Amino acid sequence: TCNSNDLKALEGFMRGLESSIDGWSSNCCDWVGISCKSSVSLGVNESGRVVELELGRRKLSGKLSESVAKLDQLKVLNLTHNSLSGSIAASLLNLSNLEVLDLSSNDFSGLFPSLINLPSLRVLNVYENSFHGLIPASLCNNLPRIREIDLAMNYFDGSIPVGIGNCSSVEYLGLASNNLSGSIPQELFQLSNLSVLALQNNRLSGALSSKLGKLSNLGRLDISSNKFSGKIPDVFLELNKLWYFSAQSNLFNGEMPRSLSNSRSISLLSLRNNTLSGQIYLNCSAMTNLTSLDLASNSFSGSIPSNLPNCLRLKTINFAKIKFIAQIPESFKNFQSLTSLSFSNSSIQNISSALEILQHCQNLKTLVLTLNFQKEELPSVPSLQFKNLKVLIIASCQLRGTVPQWLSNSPSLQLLDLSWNQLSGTIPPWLGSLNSLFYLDLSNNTFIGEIPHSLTSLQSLVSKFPPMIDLSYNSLNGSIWPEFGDLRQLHVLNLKNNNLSGNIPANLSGMTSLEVLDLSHNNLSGNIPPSLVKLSFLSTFSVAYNKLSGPIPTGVQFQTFPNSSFEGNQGLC
Template sequence: MNLRGIVSKSLGNLDQLRFLNISTNYLSGSLPQELFALQHLEVLDLSNSQLSGLVPEVINLPSIQVLNLANNALEGRQPILSKSRNLPEFIIRYNQFSSTVDAGICNNSPQTRVIDLSSNRFLGNLPIGLGNCQSLKYLFLDSNNLSGSLPDDLFKLSSLKLLDIHGNRFSGKLDKRMGNLSGLIYLAVSYNRFSGTIPDVLGGFANLQNFSAQGNDLEGQLLNSLSSCSTLEHLDLRNNLLNGTNNLNCTALPHLHFLDLGNNQLEASILDQLSFCRELKSLNLDGNRLGGQIPESFKNLQSLVYLSVSKSTLKNISKTLQILQQCQSLTMLLLGANFKSEEIPHDGIWGFRRPKLLSIPDSALSGAIPLWLKGCGKLEVLDLSRNHLTGIIAPWIGSFNNLFYLDLPNNSLTGEISKNLVQLIKLIVFDPLIKPNQQLETLTYELLHALPESIDLSNNRLSGQVWPEFGNFARLQILDLSWNNITGTIPTNSSLMLSLEILDLSHNDLSGMLHTTN
């Protein structure tokens, strides 16, 4: 449907109406009061429109079973359905409801299975009363301003399969009684103010697939009890204070595909154990205290697609690359801010064929752009910025048909900009972006396409001219050639760079003027 306009109050005259679904339209304005007095209405779905205004605080819909007001701009307090005795689904996410949460819905309708209050403006403590919804399976409270500790009766919800409270201001320790929620499949407590250690009760979650607790102040070691969650697929503990050794038994986690332990205080001993996580597809360890070297056993991670170990004080870039090139599925590799003042290797690297993203900035690496990169023909993003690289920009980089992000600033590169470089086809041709279907392909897609089309060669010692063919880069958004020794005139066809947002040619010896389209 493609309905527009307001919701007519004449709908209130349909006193026998049982089912009303006008979701996913372009309806606007406020909701008529008459709509909330239909005595026989069982399903009311007004989701995914542009509705606004106040919703009555008390709604008189005694027969209602599904109330879905999601994805609008509705305001007021949380609606109270005082006469409803059988409301399986109560969904008001993505609105502007405010004030405190009312748990009365569980007193009136203890058989409720879904409560979704996410992405509103609720604040204050979570009240006692939700524990009365003994059939509750899905509880979404994320992305509000809720605070304090979790109420005691929340831990009585033994039927709960999903609990999402991320993006609030809950504080204190994660309660050991969390273990009572043994039926959980999905548990998200991220981006709150929880502190202390992760309770050693997670081993009782026989069906847990996703546990996210990033962005808190959790400390201590990774618990061995996590290894008892044999169905675990996604574990995200990024941005905490975890430290010490690793007690995670990867051999007991055959389905673990996603592991993010970035920005903690973990040490090198974690690396050996993680090499047993043979089904890992995405691994983030950046911002830890790893030190040492990537172990030889990492070559066993044949399913690994994404690896980030940036800012981890690693050493021996040559050995690291020799090991990681044997990870045949590796597509995205981030190694920045490691290997301080080492030389980028030119020999012994032969196996990188699949990478779409290679990032090794901020490492003070010396040497020339290595020839083995020529074999990385699928590269879309190459970042070797802020090193001490010398020599020329290899002309064969221009043959990378998929390259759209080239970041080489703050090095000591010399020579002319190769005319081959202005043949990067991805920056010339507008092609439709094909969205992938698989989950990890979606992750790769989102990471790559969050970056702008960019060429940054600034702060080097490049000479020669700005080739007129730069004007063919119709997709280029950023071009920075500043702080070099480039001479000649500014190409007259620069106005053809229709997507250009940032152009910096300063601190060169260029003449002429920029040309713009009329």
């Protein structure tokens, strides 16, 4: 049997909402989202008390009534993922039985209540709201049972409070995605039970202290996207549980500390977009947990470290925007762990050698070679085989050649981007036979001849990065096959700046998911087929600069297209 004073409180709460909660019978202890425990359980009159109110993802809207603080036996309040807004009553943080507070993913704003007394609280979740001002200075002075604090994705600003050290039982502390600035207070390095520290996406600056070594339970540390500067402290011997470290996008300099090069624990390491100098060095017999390594966009000199294939767990590698001026070492022939490689804009030479070597990597799914090998010849040798390859991107390399047959040795290929090279010849009809291939970018080469009918037959675009065939800026001729209509999964078809001829097929609307359709700058005749009005998702369209004539379809999407996307045609009206 439900309690009197608790029902009054639940009423005020309902009074504050904008819509009624389904499932709320007049006995509230049987209501959905509520849990009761007897007065004598919690220890002459005995009633049900409301210990747990769980409303998550209920599509609720309104303020959060001050009266909710009148349930004193409340243990867990979970409001997550709703539309609630307004401020938080000071009293809502004075509850002495409260264990779990989850307000995350709502519209709450205002200052966050500065006095928090929740002597029983395990969990505090305000993640992703509109709160602003300071993180409460005394926040940790009253939370002796505390485990996780998540303030992330808010407007908190100023420095991280010096009082942060009084939080010594805490394990998870997310401060990420706020307006926080300044140096990290030393007190922070006194929380010794802390296994996750997320400071990412703030204005924080200054040094990263040696004192970081004091947090010896740290498994995951994200300081990325800040103003942090100077050298990365050589502390990694002591942080022996740490598997995830991202310092990406800061002002760090100097070279990587030897202990980081020696970490037994580190798994995902991301240093990208700092300015770090010297030669990349990893002791690959030490770092046996290393899986992802991102050094991209940094000041390194020297060569590509050839000892790297000795890393037995190392799967993905991003070396982009590091200027080596080097070939790929032959030792890469031995890399069995490697699944993903990006050398993009790294000054790599000898694509002939690069591909001879990289093909012996059995497990490589994805290879990004963009902005290297300037004006070199794309290898034509049929015997190169990348069996497990899924993504191949080699773009803006000014590569000379035809589309090579050795690609056919990549049967499982999903994504192929050859755009912005000097490639020529006809588009090979065998491209149509790649069954997994949903993204093809051949644009801005010199290709000639006709679009192969087999493209019309590609398995992945028929039935079950946006799916795209982009042939634009070539010398292509012939007409647009009406069987393009069989591609029901195609989002983008970009044919612009070719010389294509005849009529827009009309069967073109079987393409149910077509979003972008660009035919501009060709030589096309006839009318825009009225059936094209059937493409429900087509946001952007151009036939501009052709020989087309007739009425423009009445449409609605058609009604949206700018004047610009019909211009250049004889008869359009």
